[PDB]
């Protein structure tokens with residue numbers, strides 16, 4: 019039972035929950051790979067039993083009739099067809115628990131308030147699109163953002179799967195040039211490549227929302243244009259720097275991850291897009307200022323008349339903060355839900371104390387919880403964390419080509 | 420071998436050096452404990468042979484006559500005495516290599532330029548103090564700082580250890596109040612209490628330099644005052660915020676870690692203080708802004724007329740940026756060596772490239788290498804790292820009290 023210390027306060031806890039963390043991570047006694055982004059019939063029943071077990075644990079119903087009754091049919095279902103079907107409340111419980119278990123998510127204080135849209139009765143590429151469009155409309159909710167996951171059907175051996183080919187529902191275009199440089203988002207060129215070679219006529223500039231390459235089992239993907247009315251976007255302005263608006267920056271309202279594999283009770287859902295709301299550093303610091311994304315830092319510094327001829331003027335730092343200020347200001351002005359990295363990390367600390375009492379600890383990935391600016395000014399920086407893998411969970415998966 | 424990616428640029432390396440990791444860390448395939456701050460003759464023999472092989476590799480005479488002679492000599496001296504002695508050139512190489520292997524040091528581009536003072540003939544605490552004064556005088560060098568280490572007698576059987584009780588050579592006192600409060604540096608309350616308990620007449624200021632507590636073998640510690648004129652300090656001012664000077668803030672020139680253990684070829688040196696020069700965030704962000712340290716952030720933000728009622732104004736981020744500006748400005752003005760987090764992380768990137776060429780990898784602790792502000796604005800942020808323990812090495816050791 020690992021001893022965990024907070025270095026700001028001096029408080030100590032023990033992670034007893036770590037004792038039940040199985041699917042091995044990348045670290046060995048001889049080397050730590052904690053900073054790596056991607057770490058390198060009898061079975062389906064084992065992962066199914068334990069999931070059912072914790073479901074009834076939660077609702078005080080272990081030592082029941084319904085417990086072993088539910089235990090009995092799942093094995094019967096796998097005995098007959100080789101897989102099994104989840105009860106809707108199980109699917110809901112599984113969805114929320116997965117979020118609860120995501121080591122890298124700083125927003126988990128909200129894990130209990132999640133809207134699950136059951137799309138398991140899906141059968142083609144146009145029905146998927148309609149589900150996604152319901153999701154986006156509901157989640158966006160005219161700027162009052164609501165967490166949501168849409169679960170598409172469980173993958174089954176033989177015959178293919180549903181996959182959203184975009185990493186998010188809303189992504190901006192990345193266009194190659196006569197040279198190699200990119201107008202738009204350099205993160206999303208692999209997909210912009212495929213959007214055109216499947217037959218989308220490429221737009222003009224830096225902020226073109228991409229079409230959804232949606233794919234139903236076996237038969238290849240098909241493109242879908244998003245309704246401009248559905249895609250809520252926020253123009254970026256600065257509260258006191260009048261020229262910032264002229265930079266012509268925008269970002270979308272809805273962070274919706276569409277390439278991760280949802281795994282519940284040994285069942286694998288290649289298509290299960292979840293969505294919440296942005297932490298402002300995500301947009302302002304990583305999306306806009308990363309050298310390999312929009313890379314705008316220098317441009318804003320020039321506008322602020324900053325001395326870019328010496329690193330020691332801290333011009334990078336100064337311009338980064340103002341970019342973040344603009345993001346917060348613009349989203350608030352547009353009445354779109356957003357949280358600053360101080361509020362967010364403080365809620366995470368609160369989440370940590372909750373999970374300590376409820377579950378005896380919490381899987382947390384330090385490098386991802388600590389925000390990309392002003393890290394030691396937030397309370398999570400001085401908090402040791404234990405990282406490990408619990409089920410149910412979201413996992414990464416291969417790109418469907 | 421572990422594959423490692425730079426996400427800023429797309430680079431890919433493999434850390435083969437990790438395979439020779441002569442020791443084991445806190446992580447298991449079950450759980451990563453990376454974020455945790457604190458993670459006979461036959462084995463003494465194999466440790467020594469390892470280091471001798473290293474030394475004769477470095478001078479390009481592996482497997483030679485002189486090499487096998489030394490091996491035989493060491494095996495012989497461990498037989499007669501249970502220990503052995505380092506040659507001076509072996510000691511210099513071993514001290515550099517210990518710096519080179521230190522996973523949490525961002526300053527390792529410099530590892531080759533280290534001044535090694537051999538104090539292994541030291542015989543008392545009074546002599547110890549003379550050796551330390553010379554170290555401080557040499558390393559400080561009127562503001563033009565030079566990297567150095569002084570090596571005191573090794574751990575030996577039958578005799579106690581030389582120890583410096585102070586965690587650094589220069590520390591400010593931390594006096595408890597009856598607000599429950601601390602006046603001065605809260606990180607130094609315990610060592611301050613020790614000093615008083617050992618006869619020191621305490622001051623009452625916020626920046627009172629502590630006396631040294633030096634322990635000769637099988638002796639109580641002895642108190643020694645540093646001459647005021649040996650301790651170079653830097654009053655802190657801001658280039659455009661003139662009220663900043665009225666805060667009465669100061670910091671010292673010389674960062675000299677004195678409580679770590681140096682291990683070379685199985686031999687242990689419980690007292691071997693080493694010093695470099697500061698990276699500005701150590702002072703600006705950690706020492707002055709940590710809520711459990713000097714904690715000046717709010718008072719600065721208030722003086723800056725920022726809105727400290729709400730977090731989304733990013734008052735914390737703005738106050739901290741200016742505190743770091745003040746530090747950089749002040750040291751440059753005082754002509755005292757200092758490096759900003761941009762230059763330092765940039766040179767560490769070059770170090771990683773050097774080390775991959777030279778040794779096939781580099782032990783590095785992401786969470787300590789990434790600066791405490793502006794993390795993703797530095798190139799180390801997007802660099803995956805492998806953390807592991809190579810010897811020779813600096814290790815933590817328990818406090819002597």
Ligand code: HEM
Pocket residue numbers: 113117120122123124125128132165166167292293294295296297300357362386412
């Ligand atoms: C409601 C407010 C939410 C906030 C403020 C938030 C914030 C964040 C942030 C900042 C990250 C870091 C990822 C990165 O920077 O690359 C993250 C990751 C993650 N989040 Fe959340 N999130 C929210 C909602 C959700 C929801 C609703 C789910 C699932 C139902 C979720 C699951 C995850 C997962 C699985 C990751 C890991 C991503 C990866 O490995 O690339 N989060 N979250």
Ligand code: HEM
Pocket residue numbers: 514518521523524525526527529533566567568693694695696697698701758763787813
């Ligand atoms: C010359 C310029 C140097 C710079 C800029 C530098 C930079 C740093 C920084 C920023 C840290 C992080 C510690 C913290 O934030 O609390 C660190 C740790 C460390 N440094 Fe360096 N350093 C320098 C010189 C040296 C030298 C000369 C040695 C040894 C010969 C050394 C050995 C170490 C060790 C062992 C640690 C980790 C100590 C711990 O974890 O408590 N450094 N260094």
Ligand SMILES: CNCCCc1cc(F)cc(CCc2cc(C)cc(N)n2)c1
Pocket residue numbers: 185273274275292293294295296297300304
């Ligand atoms: C190859 N893909 C690997 C990276 C995946 C990823 C990157 C990223 F910057 C951001 C995300 C999602 C971040 C997120 C997700 C959600 C649901 C809410 C929120 N505020 N933020 C994922």
Ligand SMILES: CNCCCc1cc(F)cc(CCc2cc(C)cc(N)n2)c1
Pocket residue numbers: 456526674675676693694695696697698701815
């Ligand atoms: C035992 N507790 C673990 C952390 C110890 C520690 C604290 C600290 F403030 C500073 C350091 C070393 C900082 C340092 C050391 C040196 C030699 C140069 C430089 N720029 N910075 C260590």
Ligand SMILES: C[C@H](O)[C@H](O)[C@H]1CNc2nc(N)[nH]c(=O)c2N1
Pocket residue numbers: 025399400401402454455456786787788
């Ligand atoms: C708990 C956490 O690991 C701890 O506070 C670490 C994080 N990273 C750090 N990095 C550096 N350079 N110095 C530090 O003191 C710390 N503190």
Ligand SMILES: C[C@H](O)[C@H](O)[C@H]1CNc2nc(N)[nH]c(=O)c2N1
Pocket residue numbers: 053054055385386387426800801802803804
């Ligand atoms: C190398 C490093 O592990 C990698 O760049 C990680 C670090 N932490 C991160 N944290 C978040 N939230 N998002 C990221 O993309 C990264 N990148």
Ligand SMILES: [Cl-]
Pocket residue numbers: 273300305
């Ligand atoms: Cl994003």
Ligand SMILES: [Cl-]
Pocket residue numbers: 674701706
């Ligand atoms: Cl310090």
Ligand SMILES: [Gd]
Pocket residue numbers: none
């Ligand atoms: Gd102008």
Ligand SMILES: [Gd]
Pocket residue numbers: 659660661
């Ligand atoms: Gd002024």
Ligand SMILES: [Zn+2]
Pocket residue numbers: 045049050051052446450451452453
């Ligand atoms: Zn690890």
